[PDB]
C-alpha cells in the first residue's frame, strides 16, 4: 500500500469543572531512549480533551506551546501540561500516518471514517449546480487531525453518489449533510474517480 506521514497541530483548552481531562504517560514502551515521552494514555467524561475537536489514546504530542519532546527528557514535558492551563489552553503538533480507510475500485471509491457524536471533523462539502439528476456531492476542504483528510483520500475536485446508506441521486449537499451527520458512527464515503 501507499501512505504519506504527515503532522498537524492540537489545541487543548481548559475547563471551569476539571479543565483538561487528558492522561498523559512518560514513555509506555521504556527501554533505549524514548520516541514517545509524552503521551496520552486515557482522556475524561466531560472534558474539553475529547471535545477539543480531535484527541485520541495516544497523542503523540511532539511539541506543547513551541517546546519540542523526543528531543529532550519527558518529565519537562509532562510539566507543561500539569502545568499546560495558565491561559487556559495549549496548543501542540502531532505526527501520523493517513489511513485506516482506503478502498477504492474505479470509478468508486470507499471512505469508511469512524464517526463520533459532535466532534471537530473539518470537512467542507459543496455543490456544483442543482439542476441535473445525480448531483454528487463536492468536497470543498478538509481539516487536519480529524479522520476526514486523515483517510487520505477526500481529494477536492472529486463526486460523490452515496453516503453511509443515502444517495445524492435525489440531489441535495444538504441531504448529504444530515445522512454524512445522523451517520455519527460511521460514515461511509462513495467518491467518484475517472481520470483524463
Same mark, same amino acid.
Given at each position: 500500500?501507499?501512505?504519506?506521514?504527515?503532522?498537524?497541530?492540537?489545541?487543548?483548552?481548559?475547563?471551569?469543572?476539571?479543565g483538561?481531562?487528558?492522561?498523559?504517560?512518560?514513555?509506555?514502551?521504556?527501554?533505549?531512549?524514548?520516541? &514517545?515521552?509524552? *503521551?496520552?494514555?486515557? $482522556?475524561?467524561a466531560? !472534558?474539553?480533551?475529547?471535545?477539543?475537536?480531535? %484527541?485520541? @489514546?495516544? #497523542?503523540?504530542?511532539?511539541?506543547?506551546?513551541?517546546?519540542?519532546?523526543?528531543?529532550?527528557?519527558?518529565?519537562?514535558?509532562?510539566?507543561?501540561?500539569?502545568?499546560?492551563?495558565?491561559?487556559?489552553?495549549?496548543?501542540?503538533?502531532?505526527?501520523?500516518?493517513?489511513?485506516?480507510?482506503?478502498?477504492?475500485?474505479?470509478?468508486?471509491?470507499?471512505?469508511?471514517?469512524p464517526?463520533?457524536? &459532535?466532534?471537530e *471533523?473539518?470537512?467542507? $462539502?459543496?455543490?456544483? !449546480?442543482?439542476?441535473?439528476?445525480?448531483?454528487? %456531492?463536492? @468536497?470543498? #476542504?478538509?481539516?487536519?487531525?480529524?479522520?476526514?483528510?486523515?483517510?487520505?483520500?477526500?481529494?477536492?475536485?472529486?463526486?460523490?453518489?452515496?453516503?453511509?446508506?443515502?444517495?445524492?441521486?435525489?440531489?441535495?449537499?444538504?441531504?448529504?449533510?444530515?445522512?454524512?451527520?445522523?451517520?455519527?458512527?460511521?460514515?461511509?464515503?462513495?467518491?467518484?474517480?475517472?481520470?483524463?
Amino acid at each position: 500500500q501507499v501512505v504519506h506521514t504527515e503532522t498537524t497541530e492540537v489545541v487543548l483548552t481548559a475547563d471551569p469543572v476539571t479543565g483538561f481531562g487528558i492522561q498523559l504517560q512518560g514513555s509506555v514502551f521504556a527501554t533505549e531512549t524514548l520516541s &514517545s515521552p509524552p *503521551l496520552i494514555s486515557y $482522556i475524561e467524561a466531560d !472534558s474539553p480533551a475529547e471535545r477539543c475537536g480531535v %484527541l485520541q @489514546i495516544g #497523542d503523540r504530542v511532539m511539541a506543547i506551546n513551541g517546546i519540542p519532546t523526543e528531543d529532550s527528557t519527558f518529565e519537562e514535558a509532562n510539566q507543561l501540561l500539569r502545568d499546560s492551563s495558565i491561559t487556559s489552553k495549549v496548543t501542540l503538533e502531532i505526527e501520523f500516518d493517513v489511513a485506516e480507510s482506503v478502498i477504492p475500485s474505479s470509478g468508486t471509491f470507499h471512505v469508511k471514517l469512524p464517526k463520533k457524536h &459532535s466532534v471537530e *471533523l473539518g470537512i467542507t $462539502i459543496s455543490s456544483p !449546480s442543482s439542476r441535473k439528476p445525480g448531483d454528487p %456531492l463536492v @468536497i470543498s #476542504d478538509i481539516k487536519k487531525g480529524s479522520v476526514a483528510h486523515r483517510t487520505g483520500t477526500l481529494e477536492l475536485g472529486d463526486k460523490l453518489l452515496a453516503i453511509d446508506n443515502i444517495r445524492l441521486d435525489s440531489c441535495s449537499m444538504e441531504d448529504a449533510v444530515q445522512i454524512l451527520q445522523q451517520c455519527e458512527d460511521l460514515v461511509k464515503l462513495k467518491i467518484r474517480k475517472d481520470e483524463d
